[PDB]
Motif scaffolding. Structure first.
Motif, short mmCIF file in Angstrom:
data_model
loop_
_atom_site.label_atom_id
_atom_site.label_comp_id
_atom_site.label_asym_id
_atom_site.label_seq_id
_atom_site.Cartn_x
_atom_site.Cartn_y
_atom_site.Cartn_z
N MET A 164 -21.65 15.70 48.86
CA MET A 164 -20.76 16.03 48.31
C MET A 164 -20.51 17.82 48.11
N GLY A 165 -21.26 18.37 49.81
CA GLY A 165 -20.50 19.55 50.24
C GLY A 165 -20.21 19.73 51.47
N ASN A 166 -20.19 20.83 52.24
CA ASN A 166 -19.72 21.53 53.39
C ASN A 166 -19.43 20.76 54.80
N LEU A 167 -20.21 20.53 55.04
CA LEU A 167 -20.59 19.86 56.70
C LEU A 167 -19.68 18.37 56.57
N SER A 168 -18.90 17.81 57.18
CA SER A 168 -19.52 17.43 59.14
C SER A 168 -19.50 16.79 59.71
N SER A 169 -19.24 16.29 60.83
CA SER A 169 -19.83 15.18 61.60
C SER A 169 -20.86 14.89 61.73
N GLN A 170 -21.79 15.64 61.03
CA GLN A 170 -23.18 15.37 61.36
C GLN A 170 -23.28 14.38 60.25
N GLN A 171 -22.78 13.91 58.76
CA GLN A 171 -22.38 13.06 57.91
C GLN A 171 -23.03 11.91 58.58
N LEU A 172 -22.58 11.48 59.83
CA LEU A 172 -22.46 11.12 60.89
C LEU A 172 -24.19 10.67 60.84
N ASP A 173 -24.61 11.46 61.51
CA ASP A 173 -26.46 11.45 61.27
C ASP A 173 -27.11 11.19 60.26
N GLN A 174 -26.67 12.25 58.83
CA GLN A 174 -27.17 12.07 57.89
C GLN A 174 -27.28 10.51 57.39
N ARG A 175 -26.18 9.14 57.90
CA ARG A 175 -25.85 8.15 57.80
C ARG A 175 -27.21 7.28 58.77
N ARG A 176 -27.63 7.61 59.35
CA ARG A 176 -28.23 7.32 60.15
C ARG A 176 -30.13 7.35 59.88
N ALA A 177 -29.92 8.40 59.53
CA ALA A 177 -31.27 8.59 59.33
C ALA A 177 -31.73 8.30 58.18
N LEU A 178 -30.86 8.65 56.84
CA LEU A 178 -31.10 7.79 55.52
C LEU A 178 -31.47 6.21 55.87
N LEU A 179 -30.48 5.34 56.46
CA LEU A 179 -30.66 4.17 56.85
C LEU A 179 -32.21 4.42 57.48
N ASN A 180 -32.41 4.84 58.05
CA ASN A 180 -33.39 5.13 58.51
C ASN A 180 -34.67 4.65 57.49
N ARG A 216 -16.30 11.81 53.67
CA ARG A 216 -15.56 12.89 54.19
C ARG A 216 -13.73 12.16 54.66
N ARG A 217 -12.84 12.25 53.69
CA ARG A 217 -12.53 12.66 53.96
C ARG A 217 -10.80 12.80 54.08
N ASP A 218 -9.83 13.83 54.53
CA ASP A 218 -9.06 15.13 55.06
C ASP A 218 -7.66 14.89 54.43
N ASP A 219 -7.36 15.34 54.12
CA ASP A 219 -5.61 15.77 54.43
C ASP A 219 -4.33 14.79 55.85
N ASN A 220 -5.74 14.87 57.00
CA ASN A 220 -5.05 14.11 58.07
C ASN A 220 -5.39 12.87 58.80
N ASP A 221 -6.68 12.13 57.97
CA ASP A 221 -7.20 11.25 57.74
C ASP A 221 -5.21 10.44 56.37
#
Length: 306
Positions: free
Chosen positions: A108-124, A51-56
């Motif tokens: 493709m949802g509203n979260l978050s800085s928890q995408q980082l954990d989604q990734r790790r767990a998915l990789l898991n 997830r990348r926004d205008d600040n990035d």
RNA sequence: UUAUCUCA
């Protein structure tokens, strides 16, 4: 077929190719001395988030401007109108049509800085999106630039600018014969440790020229040989613009080249065509284009009068 | 949507 097109274009367009090793290396030196490689690290990372926004994006564009200021090889805003001149009227029709083809492929949802954990767990047991107010501001901010590749390879790889140049030159020579690939890169790493930095497993699409890739390294290596008639070293100016398009059309006919439809495939023909038509003044493949606004089909228009 | 990933 792809490499065949590439090579036919090279032979046909060889007259417009130039020796730019000097400049590219001079520009790399400028960046090495003047650029904030701390911010380079950040932007690298920011660009890798899904997830990348205008600040990035603002962060990326600011860095781009910093780089635009240190380098001499730039493209400048230069609108082009193509008219019946050294170009035939049939040619204008082909161009007018092919420019349209390019345009249409872009249309493709509203979260978050928890995408980082989604990734790790998915990789898991990685599509990356933009959330931006105005997507015009992505246009021209994501290209690759040899002088920048050199600079980053050098600082991040902690070697001599020269070690980078020699490594990339080898990629460049291979490139005159075939499209270099991951295995070739791996075999080249023996004599050139610096190439370990180009991690093809970790490289990816649309993450900007601050992150390494084999493709960007090859683009750089092409500018390292003062010959080879590499397309990368082609310069376009308002005078030479039509001659270049006409020469491309001649190859297009001869080899039956065309604009693909499948959204993923980008081929030698549509590549050179979009790149040339973005501006009538610069180095279409290798310059700093971050200053340019608009797309090829907006910056080059066809005039059927006569 | 990013002129970019990887691939002959």
């Amino acid at each position: 077929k792809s490499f065949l097109w590439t090579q036919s274009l090279r032979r046909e367009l060889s007259g417009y190719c130039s020796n730019i090793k000097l400049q590219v290396v001079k520009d790399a030196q400028a960046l090495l001395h003047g650029l904030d490689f701390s911010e380079v690290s950040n932007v690298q990372r920011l660009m890798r988030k899904e997830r990348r926004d205008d600040n990035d994006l603002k962060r990326l564009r600011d860095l781009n401007q910093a780089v635009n200021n240190l380098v001499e090889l730039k493209s400048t805003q230069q609108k082009s109108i193509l008219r019946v001149g050294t170009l035939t009227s049939d040619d204008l029709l082909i161009l007018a049509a092919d420019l349209e083809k390019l345009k249409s492929k872009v249309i493709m949802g509203n979260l978050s800085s928890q995408q980082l954990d989604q990734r790790r767990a998915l990789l898991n047991m990685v599509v990356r999106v933009w959330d931006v107010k105005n997507a015009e501001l992505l246009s021209n901010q994501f290209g690759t630039m040899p002088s920048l590749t050199l600079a980053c390879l050098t600082k991040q790889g902690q070697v001599d600018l020269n070690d980078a140049v020699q490594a990339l030159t080898d990629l460049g020579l291979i490139y005159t014969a075939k499209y270099p690939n991951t295995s070739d890169l791996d075999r080249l790493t023996q004599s050139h440790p610096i190439l370990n930095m180009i991690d093809t497993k970790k490289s990816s699409l649309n993450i900007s020229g601050y992150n390494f890739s084999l493709g960007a390294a090859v683009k750089a290596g092409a500018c390292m040989l003062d010959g080879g008639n590499m397309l990368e070293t082609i310069k376009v100016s308002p005078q030479t613009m039509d001659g270049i398009l006409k020469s491309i059309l001649k190859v297009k006919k001869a080899l039956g080249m065309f604009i693909s439809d499948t959204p993923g495939e980008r081929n030698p023909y549509e590549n050179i065509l979009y790149k040339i038509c973005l501006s009538g003044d610069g180095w279409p493949y290798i310059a700093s284009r971050t200053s340019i606004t608009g797309r090829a089909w907006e910056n080059t228009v066809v005039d059927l009068e006569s």
